[PDB]
Design a protein around this ligand. Structure first.
Ligand SMILES: CC1=N[C@H]2[C@@H](O1)O[C@](F)(CO)[C@@H](O)[C@@H]2O
Ligand SMILES: CC1=N[C@H]2[C@@H](O1)O[C@](F)(CO)[C@@H](O)[C@@H]2O
Ligand SMILES: [Ca+2]
Ligand SMILES: [Ca+2]
Ligand code: NA
Ligand code: NA
Lengths: 640, 636
């Protein structure tokens, strides 16, 4: 099992032992990064040959080495091992494949000829929210090397030295030193560190700003950076002028990229960066495609801000930019649904269009470890799209990331995949396995027919498995940083499962007293879920923690409200059928941070000092006046 | 169909009820104890007569009023309501009883003659650890009033203005204003605020220290304090001299208590304060008995530091001190088992010995609201010991403290009662309901015999109820302070119940794969419990959080170990059967704060700077350490 799967693989069905005595051939001339991996894997003998084509070590294998950048030939048989790159990166990649072949001190007899289908592959740290930590970025870069991703584009929107206004200023010493270590680690792992700049919100089209931009790039070059990007995404005003962006990019190309001895990628992200944002008959994209120097890459997110790449979609862009688009794929980025983790499989992208793209990069979540699921899958897709297997690669990623609890992580991920409704209109599948038992159960229950015991048991099994998975994940110490990222969702996922269990016990409801016990327990679990949703992940945009939102929570919520109705009809009672706990009383009320709002007479659960009120455009300042009751969008802000 | 706590000495009911009056004439309002009138006026033509023996208002009932301090006569019929105390406190107690009779604007037709069997009843806040907050104390004093406790002895061991060396120093302004408020609220609820001082560890038997002590009592008098105590418990050296203690207390009596216009209680706690800590062949207790002025109370905790009061036990002390002991009952105090909550019923004290005690106070937990279970029960016991009903009063206390979730709190409380092993040798029953089903299930299961299905189901129902109770208590907003206190134990108790369920699924078992899932879930739940035990309640003495320790956890653990053993035999496997999570490898290792020890080679889960090693010492100068009583201290 190899990720990414190689272009060609012949397995012979013999085992070889990794040699106890071995003779290394080419160690002094091969890529030192590759040699390093080899010597770490190891400990007159069997010949091992390592090198790039043209090296004496492997020259005789020239006809086996694919004539492709980053290509390699790998061979293991009873007499020798060959590890031969088309180029230095190819040799390194041969080693990353070799490392996966190796199991319990043993190797299969194999022959591999391999190379990437897409030239640039990797990650753009390009989101809004808390930028990745230094430690997370160091862990990312080694993960990229392992999965043959050759590109990391550094551009966190909330880094003030990447965007406005402090893009003009050189990083302070501490950050500068850390960026320098990132570049060293990137180089060692055969990843191009691409430093991007995002200057467009306040850029002036004059000599001063032009010189300041170049001076900043020069400071980055001194730190070791050899690839560069200028991003004009999500800005307004003069900085959106395509003639001027092209001129600036061409000036960078001619005065910097064609002036330093060793600059690699020069990349730009347009302002009209997906089809829906492209002004019809407006010539923004035709100006870039026509004026931009042919070596400069142009990024593109597809037909929408968030979209999967189609053949019709990529033909539409390429005809305009006159070159193959450099894909900026907006998944698993969650910076517009920050209360959701997006841990499902990578899918939706046409697997036959590798020739139509210059690069394919993924914009990930602010949760770095959790993003490795999709990242590993994108690595797989971009290297060998023709053999890309969505579900197997998802499972492979999970087993790679958390071998000691892969099935528990699979369980958690399967039910934390969808985005919920959103302004981008982008959705993913979730909980599809149990979705037929769910829909069957609910249809039968609601209308008045008997449900199938099997479906009920299926639901029971799932909640049971959810609780097992949550508790095992919380205490897993194999990848602590991943567990730190996901813990709030994990707690919420567990409460979801327990709630499911108690609602199911209500459905059976042996008797009146047992029913009420179950009902009160459920009310308490709803309160607990509210508490997590108000105290975890309290960001300004989508605060809180949602989980299992597509199929499971709605099923539990609907079953609860239905069985409560049935109890009230039967026992002539008046139990509260509401499913989301709300401390305040009044369309449902909502609490977001220090706001209390009616979904587009309120009595708060206490006296708070008020700040202001907004109603639709009406507003009034409250000036800290004590408030418990309010009586007339509809939003109250309070000091909380 | 009336529940009264404490239960009155005498009660006659009629099985007729009368409505509380819309229009009523009040007689005696201006002359009765204002504290009682206020209660009556808040609780609100038909005659209502309120007053003390001697008032014109209660003249008709003078012979019905018991001739006891704090006694009262209370009567309700269709014609009139009578609330007549032998004295001012009595009238107030009449009202506290009246308040409980009142239900939904309705009163039962009743006649009550009542009085306490023990003169002084209440609480000594006399433990080590975090003193009760000011808000907690305000709540307590109000609770004492409702339950006819007339004594609050203030003596937190870790108040530096109470014990050494700063007993000599007057309270700073902030604290003094707080104590002043505590005294006002005490006075309003008919509680004697008794300020104690703990000077004996460094007292000098000279004029300088005697005057500083008297000067401190004078400052407390200016704050409104009118009852006083000197404690000599848990000290060594010259301060343990009984002649000098007696002389000092007598000086306080003669120059201060007998000189002020209105001082009430003067109380001392001896150095020999329980039989085990006394020398039968020494002169200490006989010197106090002979020399101490007869109005001075002497405290006693029983046969041991922690003990219940017996007839033989109190006889032994009374004969030596020449007066009835003022009991200092060491329950529910948990300052020596700080990882446990003690929420069980009050029991074990002889109910026939009221005449042999001048007082009975409870030394509670540092958890003030949680202590109200025992405090309510002590109030009931001390007022009417003849009628003291252990379990009904426990139930009554819980329903009083947490009416919105009484059954849930009962469940939590019944399994959080015992102290576990300790140096004081004091234990309490716990989980007695399910104990026989547990014991049978385990004996059967261990020896390869079939267990009763009913016992298995009893255990399942228990775990299920524990989970309902835990989640409901966590979210309860009726008594937020109680919930704050118990929350870490509530989390640990939920974990316990989940672990039990999963272990029982292992016993049902089904197939290999399902068993393994259950087993892995159990390991995860053990680690979670360890995390709570290492992160919550990290005090220097008994850090962490233990719950359901006497019966429920041992059962879960022993069942886990057994079923793993059988799985290993059946499948030729080597699953780990150990029942507490331990991250360091080695007899169980233990982790307490930054200490790693072998229960009376070690590989830690990481490199740590080492502090020292103790075996039964060598400092480690912060050297990096991963491999090494037997206690390793590290930096954490
Ligand atoms: C090219 C592009 N820039 C924005 C935009 O897409 O949407 C996002 F990708 C998703 O919100 C955002 O993270 C990114 O910074
Ligand atoms: C009279 C007495 N003083 C100590 C002793 O008993 O034990 C305790 F009551 C329990 O350890 C302690 O709280 C108290 O301060
Ligand atoms: Ca070479
Ligand atoms: Ca009077
Ligand atoms: Na103090
Ligand atoms: Na409290």
């Amino acid at each position: 099992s190899l990720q990414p799967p190689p272009q060609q693989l012949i397995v012979q069905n013999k085992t070889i032992d990794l040699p106890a005595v071995y003779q290394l051939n080419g160690g002094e001339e091969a890529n030192p990064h590759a040699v390093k991996v080899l010597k770490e894997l190891l400990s007159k003998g069997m010949l091992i040959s390592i090198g790039e084509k043209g090296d004496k070590s492997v020259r005789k294998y020239s006809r086996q080495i694919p004539d492709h950048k980053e290509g390699y030939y790998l061979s293991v048989n009873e007499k020798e091992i060959v590890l031969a790159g088309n180029d230095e990166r190819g040799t390194y990649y041969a080693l990353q494949t070799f490392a996966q072949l190796l199991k319990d001190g043993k190797l299969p007899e194999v022959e591999i000829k391999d190379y990437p289908s897409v030239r640039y592959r990797g990650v753009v740290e390009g989101f809004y929210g808390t930028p990745w930590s230094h430690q997370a970025r160091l862990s990312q870069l080694k993960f990229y090397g392992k999965n043959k991703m050759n590109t990391y584009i550094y551009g966190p929107k909330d880094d003030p030295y990447h965007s406005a206004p402090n893009w003009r200023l050189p990083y302070p010493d501490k950050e500068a030193a850390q960026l320098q270590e990132l570049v060293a680690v990137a180089n060692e792992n055969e990843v191009d560190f691409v430093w991007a700049i995002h200057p467009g919100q306040d850029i002036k089209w004059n000599k001063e700003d032009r010189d300041l931009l170049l001076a900043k790039f020069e400071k980055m070059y001194q730190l070791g950076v050899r690839s560069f990007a200028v991003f004009f995404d999500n800005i307004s005003g003069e900085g959106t002028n395509p003639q001027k962006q092209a001129e600036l990019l061409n000036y960078i190309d001619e005065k910097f990229a064609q002036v330093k001895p060793d600059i690699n990628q020069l990349v730009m992200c347009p302002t009209e960066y997906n089809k829906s944002w492209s002004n019809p008959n407006g010539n923004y994209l035709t100006t870039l495609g026509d004026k931009l120097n042919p070596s400069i890459q142009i990024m593109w997110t597809g037909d929408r801000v968030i979209s999967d790449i189609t053949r019709d979609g990529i033909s539409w862009i390429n005809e305009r930019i006159k070159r193959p688009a450099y894909i900026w794929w907006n998944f698993p980025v969650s910076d517009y649904v920050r209360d959701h983790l997006l841990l499902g499989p990578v899918y939706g992208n046409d697997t036959t269009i590798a020739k139509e793209m210059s690069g394919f990069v993924t914009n990930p979540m602010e949760h770095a470890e959790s993003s490795k699921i999709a990242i590993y899958s994108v690595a797989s897709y971009a290297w060998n799209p023709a053999k890309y297997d969505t579900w197997q690669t998802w499972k492979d990623a999970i087993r790679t990331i958390l071998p000691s609890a892969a099935e528990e992580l699979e369980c958690f991920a399967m039910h934390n995949s969808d985005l919920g409704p959103n302004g981008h209109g982008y959705r993913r599948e979730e909980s599809m396995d149990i979705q037929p038992a769910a829909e069957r159960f609910l249809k039968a229950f609601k209308e008045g027919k008997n449900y199938d015991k099997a479906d009920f048991e299926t639901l029971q099994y799932t909640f049971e498995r959810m609780k097992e998975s949550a508790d095992i994940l919380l205490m897993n110490t194999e990848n602590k940083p991943l567990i730190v990222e996901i813990t709030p969702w994990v707690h919420q996922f567990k409460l979801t499962a327990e709630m499911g269990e108690e609602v199911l016990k209500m459905v059976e409801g042996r008797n009146e007293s047992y029913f009420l016990r179950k009902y009160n327990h459920v009310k308490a679990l709803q309160q607990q879920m509210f508490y997590i949703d108000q105290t975890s992940n309290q960001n300004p945009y989508q605060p809180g923690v949602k989980t299992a939102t597509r199929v499971i929570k709605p099923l539990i919520d609907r079953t609860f409200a239905t069985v409560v109705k049935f109890f009230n009809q039967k026992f002539n009672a008046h139990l509260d059928a509401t499913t989301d706990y709300m401390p305040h009383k009044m369309l449902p009320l909502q609490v977001k941070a220090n706001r209390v709002l009616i979904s587009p007479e309120i009595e708060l659960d206490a006296i708070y000092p008020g700040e202001n009120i907004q109603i639709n455009r009406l507003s009034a300042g409250l000036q800290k006046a004590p408030v418990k009751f309010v009586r007339f969008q509809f939003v109250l802000t309070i000091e909380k």
